[PDB]
Paper text:
The recently identified plasmid-encoded MCR-1 enzyme is the first transmissible colistin resistance determinant and is a cause for concern for the spread of this resistance trait. MCR-1 is a phosphoethanolamine transferase that catalyzes the addition of phosphoethanolamine to lipid A to decrease colistin affinity. The location of the catalytic domain of full-length MCR-1 is presumably on the periplasmic face of the cytoplasmic membrane, based on the predicted five membrane spanning helices in the N-terminal transmembrane domain of the protein and previous results with PEA transferases. The catalytic domain of MCR-1 assumes the α/β/α fold characteristic of the alkaline phosphatase superfamily.
Residue numbers in the entry:
A (entry chain A), B (entry chain A): 218 to 541
The structure:
Amino acid sequence: DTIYHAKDAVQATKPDMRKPRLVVFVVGETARADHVSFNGYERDTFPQLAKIDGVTNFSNVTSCGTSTAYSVPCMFSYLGADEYDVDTAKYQENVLDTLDRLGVSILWRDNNSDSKGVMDKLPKAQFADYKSATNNAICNTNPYNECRDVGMLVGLDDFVAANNGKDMLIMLHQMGNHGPAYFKRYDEKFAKFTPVCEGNELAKCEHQSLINAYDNALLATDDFIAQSIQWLQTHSNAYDVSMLYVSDHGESLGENGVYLHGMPNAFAPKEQRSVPAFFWTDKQTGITPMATDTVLTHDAITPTLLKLFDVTADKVKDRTAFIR
Amino acid sequence: DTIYHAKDAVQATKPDMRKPRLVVFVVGETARADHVSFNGYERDTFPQLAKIDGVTNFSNVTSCGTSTAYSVPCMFSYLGADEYDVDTAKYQENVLDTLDRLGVSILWRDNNSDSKGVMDKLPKAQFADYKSATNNAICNTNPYNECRDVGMLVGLDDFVAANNGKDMLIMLHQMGNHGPAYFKRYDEKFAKFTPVCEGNELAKCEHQSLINAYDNALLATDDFIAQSIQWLQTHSNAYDVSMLYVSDHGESLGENGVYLHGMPNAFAPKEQRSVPAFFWTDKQTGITPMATDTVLTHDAITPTLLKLFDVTADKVKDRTAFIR
Ligand SMILES: OC[C@@H](O)[C@@H](O)[C@H](O)[C@@H](O)CO
Ligand SMILES: OC[C@@H](O)[C@@H](O)[C@H](O)[C@@H](O)CO
Ligand SMILES: [Zn+2]
Ligand SMILES: [Zn+2]
Ligand SMILES: [Zn+2]
Ligand SMILES: [Zn+2]
Ligand SMILES: [Zn+2]
Ligand SMILES: [Zn+2]
Ligand SMILES: [Zn+2]
Ligand SMILES: [Zn+2]
Ligand SMILES: [Zn+2]
Ligand SMILES: [Zn+2]
Ligand SMILES: [Zn+2]
Ligand SMILES: [Zn+2]
Ligand SMILES: [Zn+2]
Ligand SMILES: [Zn+2]
Ligand SMILES: [Zn+2]
Ligand SMILES: [Zn+2]
Ligand SMILES: [Zn+2]
Ligand SMILES: [Zn+2]
Ligand SMILES: [Zn+2]
Ligand SMILES: [Zn+2]
C-alpha cells in the first residue's frame, strides 16, 4: 500500500568509485533555538560545539509541528509541511525508503520513543531500542537509572564493519531536553546552572530554576553532539563523514502560563517551533553548508539527506536544503 | 468540473423569518499590521475607525500568501492555507458559491484588478469593474485621474433595493496601499505625513519619505472603511449590518533592501504576511467578535462569512473565525 514519491531517484556516483559516505543524523528533542548561544542566547549552552571547526549553526529553522508524533514523520517526508498529514505518513515512501532502495545502509537507534512509523517498511533489525539498559550500556550514571544518548555511540564501529565500504546513514533519536523532568536529562558533570527545579509540577518551579535545568540538559546535548562528531572523526580517512542535528520541536517554559509542547500549529507560540539545527562535515567531503541565516524548516531535511548521498529526486529537486 | 466542499451546508434561519443580513467585506491591499495604530504603530493611521463603537482590531493575522493572485482565492477557499493550491483554486467550490446557492445575493465591486477566479462561477452581472471611470464616479479628485475606493459605495442603495429583504454580501476590492506609487493612492486631504516619495524607483526614496507616503495611503483606507460602515448604518434598521476588512498581504518597505511583495512564503519576510483585520457590527446583530489577540489567518475568513449568514458547513465546522 506504499504511495511512492521518488521512484525516479538516482545516485550519481556510487561507493565503489568514490569514498563511501557515513552520516549521523541526530534527531533532537525539545530544544529551543533561542536557548542556543550561537543564536544570541545570554548563556553559553554549546561550549564544546563552539570549538569544533566545520560546524554551521542555522539561526532560522522552524519545525513542521510541535510534537514527536507529528514532526518526526514530517522530517523524513517528501511532501513538505503544507501537504504532510500525520494520518497517512506511514504509507508514503519516505527518504529512508529511497536511500535504502539505492543501497545506503540505514540504522536507527532510539533513546526517546520510536521512529513514529518512519522505519516501519525496513527490516526490524535496522531499528534498535536504546532506552533499555539491555542495549544501552550507559544508564547507571545518574540517580534515575536513565539511559543516556551517548550510549547510542557504543558499538557503532561494529555497524560500520558489517557495512564496510557502503554508504551509511545512522539516525540517533535522542532523549535530549524532554520534559517535564528536565533535571533528569543530564548527568552531574552538566549541572552548571543552579539552582534547579526538581519537580514535575512546572508552574510551581521558580522560573529561573526551571530555565537552569533546561539549560543544563542543553549542555549534555552539546556534549552528545560533540562526541558524535568525534566518533565520525575516527572514520574520516575511509569515509566522507558529516553530522546533521535538528530538534523535533521546541518547548514552552512558562511564557503566558504555557508549558511543554504539543499545541496545534494554528495557535502554538513561537517557542514550540523555533528549533536549533547544526551541520558538521569534515574538510575532505566537498559538502558546502548554506548560509547560517537561510530561512529553513524541517522540509530541508529530505533534500539534505539525498544530497549527502549524491541522490537526486524530482519531487525535491529544487527544494532548499541545509547544504548546497 | 467543480470540486465541491460544502454540499452539506445549511442555513439555520432565513431572512423571511428574521432580519435580513447585509455584510460588506473589504478585501484590502498591501496594508501592514505593524503600521496600524491599534497594533502599536507610532503614528495614528486609523483616527476615524478609532472613534467608531463596535470596531474590533485583530493584532495577530497572517495572510495566506504574499500576492493578489495567491491570497485572494485562498481567502474564499474551504481548503485552508496548507492544502490550498493556487493552480486548482478556480475549480473548487468557494464560500461565495455556497452562500449564493443558499440564496445570499453576492456582489463584487473591484477597484484593484479582478476577483482572481473567485467570482467566475457566478453570473457576470455580479462582478463590476470600478477601476474604470465609466463605472466609478470618483476619479477626478487627484492629479492621476485614479478612481478611488469610496466610489465603490456610490449606488449601493440600488443593489439593496434590487435585493430587498434578502441576505446580501458585498465585496469591495480596494486599491488600498498598492505600490510602488504609494503617493498616488490617496487624495490631498490625506497628505498628512510629509515629505513624500514621489518616484517609482523606491530604493532612491529617502526611507522616511517612503513611509510617509505609505502612511498617508493608510489614512485614506481608514476613511474608506469608516465610510463603508457609515453606509451600512444607513441600512441598520432593516438589515443586520456588519463589515469585515482583511488585507491580501503586507509589503516590504526597504528592510534589508526588499521592496513590494510577492516573495514565496518559504522565504518571505514577516512584513509581507502580517496584515490588519477589522470587524465591525451594529449593536443589534447578536454577533460577538473574537478576542483581539486570537491567532488568526485568512483561513478564518470562510467560517466568518458562513457564520455571519447563519450557515454551517462540516468542512469548517470547528475552524476558528473572527467571530463566535
Ligand atoms: O499542528 C499540529 C501540531 O504540530 C501537533 O503537535 C499536534 O497538536 C499534536 O500532534 C496533537 O497530538
Ligand atoms: O508562497 C507563495 C507566495 O505567497 C506568492 O506570493 C507567490 O510567490 C507569487 O504568487 C508568485 O507569483
Ligand atoms: Zn563559554
Ligand atoms: Zn519531542
Ligand atoms: Zn516523548
Ligand atoms: Zn509525550
Ligand atoms: Zn497537513
Ligand atoms: Zn489533509
Ligand atoms: Zn487533515
Ligand atoms: Zn486527513
Ligand atoms: Zn542495504
Ligand atoms: Zn560536580
Ligand atoms: Zn490621533
Ligand atoms: Zn495585493
Ligand atoms: Zn496588483
Ligand atoms: Zn501586481
Ligand atoms: Zn499549497
Ligand atoms: Zn499541492
Ligand atoms: Zn504545488
Ligand atoms: Zn500543483
Ligand atoms: Zn440569489
Ligand atoms: Zn490641504
